[PDB]
Amino acid sequence: LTAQDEELTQEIKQEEEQKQQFAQQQEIALEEKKRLERHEVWNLEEDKRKKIENTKSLSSEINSLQKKWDHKNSQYNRLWQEREQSQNQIRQHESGMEDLLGELQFDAEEAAFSEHEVNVHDFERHQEEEFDFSIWIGEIGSHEQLL
Amino acid sequence: ELDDLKGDQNVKESQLRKEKAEIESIEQQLKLKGIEEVRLRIQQVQQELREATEGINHLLETIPQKKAKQETCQNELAAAKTSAEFWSNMADEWEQMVRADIARGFVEVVEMDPVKIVKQLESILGKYDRSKLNEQLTKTFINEQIFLTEYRMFEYPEETERPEWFSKEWGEYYEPFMNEWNQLQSRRLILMEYKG
Amino acid sequence: REATEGINHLLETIPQKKAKQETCQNELAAAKTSAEFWSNMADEWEQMVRADIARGFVEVVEMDPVKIVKQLESILGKYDRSKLNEQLTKTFINEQIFLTEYRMFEYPEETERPEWFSKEWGEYYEPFMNEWNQLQSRRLILMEYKG
């Protein structure tokens, strides 16, 4: 903290020194500016500078919009890929469920579970939503209890 | 959203070209009032005025910032110095405490360095706890009066005088350290009469 | 010139007050932390004191520390913990001469190191947590009176 104290002492003084340097430079520039404004030159140079600054600002805003658009576009391509991935999951899963339906029918035939077919078709007549399997599980549980 | 943003960006790009085209017109008027010597000195003066104004404005904001930073540094340095002085004194006090017990010769000491002494007895922290050991010392004192009564054993708590500098109100934050030493400073001694 | 002067004066003052607000905000956060901490320590002592009261060993006006300290204002000045604990043990040893048929017995009471202790507070609070951890332990006595 003593070192920091020394650093801050030197730094604040040096900033003040630069302030005095800048004040001197500003004063000399202002004084010479008075004597220099007597031709239409300085005004022309100033406007030209403002136009250049405005072009710079437009460039910066263009880059900002470019940055935001590229960020948005990368996420958009990622989301397109994710939707395709979800479609892949649906394809993989539905195929599996089809095989499982064949397997489940096999288990029902061995165990003589007549409800298996009825429940499967009922599921296919309502696989548009959150199908409730509670009754199906209850039926297989009762069947298993009977067995 | 992408289409709207891209359209806005293209509008900005068109505007940038339009602003670029307009700079040339200023130059044309500049050329025909072409005095090069007046222009170069005017440009130098404009740059100097811009630099000076920027510097003085930035410095007017920063200098107070570093002054306040220096204020904070001084406050925290005073606090740190207080703590450093306090712990030098406290370490010296613990040195005095430890030197008192070692002097008895009840316990032998390899080297009078606190880290070394702690290393010599580190084991005991694993063995006892203050309450337990105090209890068992009382238990032993009770037990040992069955055999030795003719010797007139006796214990008496032994205490070390409070260092006077403990009196200086180091403040709230330090009171806990004084209380701990003050609490712990009390220790028990035993002396037994044997053949006179 | 007036506008520049105002902006200059503001440029100087604003950073000063901004840094002051920075310090004030830091210290205010610290103070709120301390308030929560001291609320917690007072509450911990409250649980302890309420525990002792549940035992019924000591009677009180109300569960208010200010009233309690006035009632017991002189006992802390008179004795100290080690001495009283020791002399209680001594009395326990002595009085087992008479009461031996009852099989006297003691058992230490401890506090489950409250979890909010985990939110390390360091420096200013470390001594208080250590002190409470040492002092929180108290001895209890239970007696086998006629079975």
Side-chain angles (χ1 to χ4, degrees):
Chain A
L1 294 193
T2 297
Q4 188 161 272
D5 175 55
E6 289 154 35
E7 179 193 1
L8 288 195
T9 304
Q10 286 165 33
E11 285 293 310
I12 182 62
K13 186 176 183 180
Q14 282 150 17
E15 292 203 354
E16 278 194 314
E17 282 282 20
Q18 286 191 95
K19 210 188 146 181
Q20 170 198 2
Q21 294 154 22
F22 289 157
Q24 285 165 350
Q25 286 182 341
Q26 183 191 10
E27 183 165 28
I28 290 159
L30 284 162
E31 288 288 313
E32 186 161 1
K33 200 282 200 183
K34 291 293 281 293
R35 282 175 279 156
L36 286 167
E37 188 160 46
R38 304 163 178 152
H39 306 268
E40 301 96 3
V41 185
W42 172 256
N43 292 124
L44 287 164
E45 287 282 1
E46 177 269 332
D47 284 350
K48 207 198 69 187
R49 191 159 194 158
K50 187 34 184 177
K51 297 210 157 285
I52 290 161
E53 292 171 1
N54 270 338
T55 53
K56 290 181 176 181
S57 177
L58 286 181
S59 306
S60 69
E61 293 152 36
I62 284 159
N63 280 345
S64 181
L65 297 154
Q66 185 58 36
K67 170 167 185 285
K68 175 33 71 183
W69 187 94
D70 274 322
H71 198 70
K72 284 289 188 186
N73 199 37
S74 50
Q75 289 162 209
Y76 171 79
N77 292 339
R78 174 198 94 185
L79 286 180
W80 201 84
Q81 294 158 14
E82 299 168 40
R83 196 208 71 244
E84 280 299 333
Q85 179 174 20
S86 292
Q87 290 156 253
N88 289 340
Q89 300 177 10
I90 281 170
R91 288 176 272 258
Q92 270 158 24
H93 286 340
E94 288 196 337
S95 184
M97 298 156 66
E98 298 308 329
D99 312 332
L100 287 188
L101 282 162
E103 302 164 26
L104 263 176
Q105 172 170 337
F106 173 41
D107 280 10
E109 71 196 353
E110 283 200 321
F113 190 46
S114 62
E115 312 81 358
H116 164 83
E117 314 95 339
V118 173
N119 278 255
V120 169
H121 292 89
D122 183 22
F123 164 91
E124 282 179 332
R125 294 167 221 137
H126 291 69
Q127 62 184 355
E128 294 187 3
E129 290 164 353
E130 294 278 347
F131 187 72
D132 184 0
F133 286 84
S134 63
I135 192 55
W136 199 351
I137 293 288
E139 284 194 327
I140 204 69
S142 304
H143 195 82
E144 192 196 326
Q145 191 66 70
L146 267 288
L147 279 293
Chain B
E1 299 144 31
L2 283 168
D3 283 352
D4 281 355
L5 176 66
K6 198 68 185 170
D8 292 331
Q9 196 196 322
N10 290 344
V11 164
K12 296 304 188 181
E13 283 163 25
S14 181
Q15 285 199 0
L16 174 56
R17 296 164 282 145
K18 296 186 170 182
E19 297 316 295
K20 285 175 176 182
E22 280 313 326
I23 294 171
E24 283 297 326
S25 314
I26 282 162
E27 287 273 326
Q28 286 155 8
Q29 283 168 97
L30 272 160
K31 294 161 186 181
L32 283 166
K33 311 169 179 189
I35 303 175
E36 181 148 38
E37 301 92 357
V38 160
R39 290 195 44 172
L40 68 94
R41 185 65 205 136
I42 283 170
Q43 290 160 262
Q44 292 165 15
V45 162
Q46 184 161 119
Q47 179 59 23
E48 188 76 31
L49 179 58
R50 191 64 54 84
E51 286 172 10
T53 305
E54 161 60 350
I56 212 161
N57 285 340
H58 180 65
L59 290 182
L60 282 154
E61 278 213 324
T62 57
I63 291 174
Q65 290 168 347
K66 283 184 177 170
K67 257 154 191 166
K69 284 177 181 178
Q70 169 77 55
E71 191 267 337
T72 294
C73 187
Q74 283 170 204
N75 288 350
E76 65 184 17
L77 173 57
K81 283 186 180 184
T82 298
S83 199
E85 174 192 319
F86 175 88
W87 282 124
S88 187
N89 276 356
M90 191 65 197
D92 289 349
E93 282 304 339
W94 287 130
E95 178 161 21
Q96 284 206 12
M97 186 64 72
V98 163
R99 286 177 182 277
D101 286 314
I102 292 170
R104 300 185 214 290
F106 298 166
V107 193
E108 298 166 327
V109 54
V110 174
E111 184 148 25
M112 195 58 202
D113 196 36
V115 58
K116 299 296 286 293
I117 292 174
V118 166
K119 162 56 73 174
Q120 176 186 318
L121 314 179
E122 167 52 79
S123 56
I124 196 149
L125 180 64
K127 292 160 66 177
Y128 314 117
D129 199 1
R130 189 60 77 101
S131 178
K132 185 175 52 177
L133 193 152
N134 264 271
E135 292 151 27
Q136 284 192 359
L137 177 58
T138 311
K139 191 174 178 185
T140 288
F141 190 63
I142 290 164
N143 283 359
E144 302 284 316
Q145 61 158 15
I146 298 164
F147 304 94
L148 288 73
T149 75
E150 282 207 0
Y151 296 68
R152 312 269 66 91
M153 295 66 85
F154 58 98
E155 187 263 309
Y156 67 102
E158 206 172 276
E159 306 190 72
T160 304
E161 314 312 328
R162 184 187 155 169
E164 73 275 16
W165 64 259
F166 277 165
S167 300
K168 149 193 161 176
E169 295 296 322
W170 273 94
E172 63 88 19
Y173 167 76
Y174 301 83
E175 79 168 13
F177 302 129
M178 282 74 68
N179 288 336
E180 283 155 310
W181 178 100
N182 269 259
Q183 284 185 112
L184 187 154
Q185 68 90 30
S186 48
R187 63 149 302 138
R188 294 166 81 160
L189 188 68
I190 301 174
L191 276 185
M192 60 295 298
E193 172 181 293
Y194 188 91
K195 296 191 183 181
Chain C
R1 54 187 81 159
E2 286 172 10
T4 305
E5 292 172 350
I7 295 161
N8 187 321
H9 180 65
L10 290 181
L11 282 154
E12 278 213 324
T13 57
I14 291 174
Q16 183 276 347
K17 284 183 177 170
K18 216 154 191 166
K20 196 177 181 178
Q21 168 168 36
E22 191 258 334
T23 305
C24 187
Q25 283 170 3
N26 288 350
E27 288 184 19
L28 173 57
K32 282 186 180 184
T33 298
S34 199
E36 174 151 23
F37 174 85
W38 284 125
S39 187
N40 276 341
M41 190 65 107
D43 289 349
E44 281 303 339
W45 289 130
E46 178 161 21
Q47 281 54 235
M48 293 168 78
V49 163
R50 286 177 182 277
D52 286 314
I53 292 301
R55 294 79 63 88
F57 298 167
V58 193
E59 298 166 317
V60 309
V61 174
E62 280 195 298
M63 194 58 67
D64 187 359
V66 174
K67 298 167 172 91
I68 297 299
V69 166
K70 162 55 208 71
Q71 175 186 318
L72 314 179
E73 184 59 26
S74 56
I75 193 171
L76 283 296
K78 182 160 184 177
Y79 314 117
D80 64 351
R81 188 185 172 101
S82 178
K83 186 175 175 177
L84 287 161
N85 206 18
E86 187 277 326
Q87 284 192 359
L88 177 59
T89 311
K90 192 174 179 185
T91 288
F92 189 93
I93 290 298
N94 282 359
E95 303 315 317
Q96 191 74 263
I97 298 164
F98 304 74
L99 288 146
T100 187
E101 293 294 331
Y102 294 165
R103 315 191 59 276
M104 294 170 70
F105 158 85
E106 67 172 4
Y107 66 104
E109 204 206 2
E110 306 292 321
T111 304
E112 315 312 328
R113 186 287 185 181
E115 73 275 16
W116 63 258
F117 275 90
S118 300
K119 298 155 51 176
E120 72 280 16
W121 272 272
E123 314 299 299
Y124 167 76
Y125 302 84
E126 188 63 12
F128 302 129
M129 282 89 59
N130 288 334
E131 181 155 78
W132 177 99
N133 84 13
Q134 284 104 11
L135 280 296
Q136 67 89 29
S137 193
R138 63 149 302 139
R139 218 166 81 214
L140 293 181
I141 301 174
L142 276 185
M143 293 297 173
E144 172 182 293
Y145 189 66
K146 297 191 282 181

